[PDB]
């Protein structure tokens, strides 16, 4: 089949919010989105599963973690996840500090993804073309902070997570391998997988 480019898949693929929260976030680091363009593929991909991994979560009036898939959340719901990523470093650390010095978790060396108010933690989202036990260990070493949850995804369905815990219910993580699983299709049919997958 004709190679497509990856800049219109993203386009075409990906929410305008993300794309442009992704956008923003490469060009903070200095990366160029029309040229690192696998690289924008897979920033999208992870914001996408951040949001995806905080959608539908909410706590109710009792305090107990519900899930919520109707468009309407009742107005005393509680969203269940504060997230993290794809705000700017200024306001992604002012998130951090609030929660850090109000709930008394302590705080992270690096920005995590999001942070968990059932369960008082900070989480770490991977997203891997790679074997996810390889990528949740070099997760691992990298922050140390040990108080932060890791949970990895891989674009064939394999989840690890910190001490076998996932968090989620099956449903929910089942929502984010189909988006995985439909970027991948979409990638190889627009003959883009192969080289993302090696790109990693
Ligand atoms: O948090 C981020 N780190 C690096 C890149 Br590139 C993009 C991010 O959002
Ligand atoms: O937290 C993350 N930010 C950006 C990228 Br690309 C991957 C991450 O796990
Ligand atoms: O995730 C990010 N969003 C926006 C900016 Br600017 C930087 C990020 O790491
Ligand atoms: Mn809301
Ligand atoms: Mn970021
Ligand atoms: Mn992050
Ligand atoms: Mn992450």
């Known amino acids: 089949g004709p190679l497509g480019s990856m800049e219109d898949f993203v386009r075409q693929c990906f929410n305008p919010m993300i794309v442009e929260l992704a956008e923003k976030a490469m060009k903070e680091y200095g990366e160029d989105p029309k040229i690192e363009t696998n690289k ?59 929660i850090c010095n109000t709930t008394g978790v302590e705080k992270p060396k690096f920005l995590p993804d999001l942070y968990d108010y059932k369960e008082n933690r900070f989480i770490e989202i991977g997203v891997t073309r790679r074997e996810v036990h390889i990528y949740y260990l070099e997760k691992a070493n990298k922050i140390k902070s040990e108080k932060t949850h890791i949970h990895i995804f891989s674009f064939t369905g394999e989840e690890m997570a910190t001490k076998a815990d996932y968090t989620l219910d099956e449903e929910s993580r089942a929502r984010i391998k189909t988006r995985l699983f439909t970027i991948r299709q979409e990638m190889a049919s627009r003959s883009l997988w192969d080289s993302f997958r090696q790109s990693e």
């Open 40 to 98: 924008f593929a897979a920033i999208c991909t992870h914001l996408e599963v951040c949001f995806m991994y905080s959608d539908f979560h909410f706590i109710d009036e009792r305090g107990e973690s519900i899930i919520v898939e109707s468009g309407d959340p009742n107005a005393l719901l509680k969203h269940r996840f504060e997230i993290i990523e794809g705000r700017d470093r200024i306001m992604a650390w002012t998130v951090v500090n609030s």
